[PDB]
Design a protein around this nucleic acid. Structure first.
Lengths: 55, 117, 150, 51
RNA sequence: AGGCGGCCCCCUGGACGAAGACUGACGCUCAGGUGCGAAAGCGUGGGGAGCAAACAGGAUUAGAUACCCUGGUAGUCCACGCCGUAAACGAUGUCGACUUGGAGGUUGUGCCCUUGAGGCGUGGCUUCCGGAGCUAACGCGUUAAGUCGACCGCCUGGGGA
RNA sequence: ACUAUGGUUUUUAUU
């Protein structure tokens, strides 16, 4: 729900390009989606998940 | 002077022109061609064929370096981003990778607006 | 926009063995003068008699293999802009175009007489140069300056 | 926004019209598209996909 | 209401529910006045990659002081001060009562092994028909343009203006 | 489908 110390659970809600997948696809709905987005955006700034993608 | 088998191409196609540069993965360019430099003007300077002849002019490069294995990094929206690869991959080279590397603002600072006629 | 038609089928000549003579006498024909057409039909093969090759029965129809049509240009307007496209010649009309290109110099050159104009132009047949070749050569420019059409 | 694919297919596969990329929409729509006006166009038309 | 969508740390406004309870008309509105301003402009210094009102150079053209191409000053960014403007938009003053039916979205609460993002009550927000009524006509229709209770603005043929 | 582009046509008679 908020922590960066596991990415194996966060991988399901992202793409190969590290983009966040919309809640209409993953059954998360907007409320829990907005929590997973915080765990991902923290893991991004700690360089634990890809932020930008070019290739 | 020595055959090294491997290279990487950088292609850009716009609504006015097309650019094709041949490099090594060490960033080093070895030759280049353009659709304008092919002798083309106006609404014709961007065309798939003006770019096809630029690729045939570029496919004469690197013969002494013995390059055959090719990666392609593509840019721009222009129709030239396809005919250039097709012709180069027929001119002795073999493709292994094609990837789009168009640099994009994501997203700022104010939207573009130009030419109203 | 709704009248629909076809083409008239024609038979090979009983003497000349070819379908060329069944149509070519209606080409360069004017004022209904079909006996003048039957009086100039291949009459250049006498001005070319030293350059005719074997069998005068085919010695004019062999020239169509060097008239060699490949493309025809169509020009039409879409919106304000007129465009031009070189399209490949159709499986029967390719022969009709060769039959039209072979008479381009028959009057519109300074040589005097149809037969002499035509024999001089049938001797420029391989390279196609100078006068009376515009409609044969300049149509090909458009198909070598562009090979990406739809 | 940009599309991802390991290689570009040898055909464009166009189901939908006025679509960009792959030799489409050439030097067009050069005016501003706007941030809220796309929603105004979704107010002004609601069955544009089926004309 | 103008408006708010890089992220962080600190600070903070208003809104929503169940049940229990306390206080008790403490509730509403309002000429003048006050606080609030998108953008442009202005006070004043700092900034100023990019975008670009002035404009130059080029090109277009009958002309081109505009539309087109290359630049480029102000301005756009910040702090602080002014200016209150609008196709201000959910166009319709503020507050509150009242009326037949259905379905969807969101989120509390109470209930159901929830042992089901799902149900059955029931609130707040929200979306689309629609009964009664209204409206040249479109349209509103429980977040009414309907029917009532309180208060206050604005209007009076076009042009001149 | 979209050419690169152009400004302007005196007045009046079914009572």
């Amino acid at each position: 729900e908020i922590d960066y110390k596991d990415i194996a659970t966060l991988k399901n809600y992202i793409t190969e390009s590290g983009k966040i997948v919309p809640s209409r696809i993953t059954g998360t709905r907007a409320k829990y989606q907005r929590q997973l987005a915080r765990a991902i955006k923290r893991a991004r700034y700690l360089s634990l998940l890809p932020y930008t993608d070019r290739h | 002077r020595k055959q090294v088998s491997d290279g990487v191409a950088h292609i850009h196609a716009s609504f006015n022109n097309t650019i094709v540069t041949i490099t090594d993965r060490q960033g080093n360019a070895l030759g280049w061609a353009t659709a304008g430099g092919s002798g083309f003007r106006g609404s014709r300077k961007s065309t798939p064929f003006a770019a096809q002849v630029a690729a045939e002019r570029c496919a004469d490069a690197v013969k002494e370096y013995g390059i055959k294995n090719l990666e392609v990094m593509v840019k721009g929206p222009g129709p030239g981003r396809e005919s250039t690869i097709r012709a180069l991959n027929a001119a002795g080279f073999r493709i292994t990778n094609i990837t789009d590397v168009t640099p994009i603002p994501h997203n700022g600072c104010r939207p573009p607006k130009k030419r109203r006629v | 926009r709704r009248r629909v038609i076809g083409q008239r089928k024609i038979l090979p000549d009983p003497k000349f063995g070819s379908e060329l003579l069944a149509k070519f006498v209606n080409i360069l024909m004017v004022d209904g003068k079909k006996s003048t057409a039957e009086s100039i039909v291949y009459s250049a093969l006498e001005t070319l008699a030293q350059r005719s090759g074997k069998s005068e029965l085919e010695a004019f129809e062999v020239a169509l293999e060097n008239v060699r049509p490949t493309v025809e240009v169509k020009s039409r307007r879409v919106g304000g802009s007129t465009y031009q496209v070189p399209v490949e010649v159709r499986p029967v009309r390719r022969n009709a175009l060769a039959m039209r290109w072979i008479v381009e110099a028959a009057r519109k050159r300074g040589d005097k007489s149809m037969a002499l104009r035509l024999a001089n132009e049938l001797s420029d047949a391989a390279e196609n140069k100078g006068t009376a070749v515009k409609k044969r050569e300049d149509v090909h420019r458009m198909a070598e300056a562009n090979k990406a059409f739809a | 926004i940009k599309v991802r694919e390991n290689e570009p297919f040898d055909v464009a596969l166009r189901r939908f019209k006025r679509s960009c990329e792959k030799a489409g929409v050439l030097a067009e729509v050069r005016r501003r598209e706007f941030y809220e006006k796309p929603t105004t166009e979704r107010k002004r038309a609601k069955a544009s996909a089926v004309k």
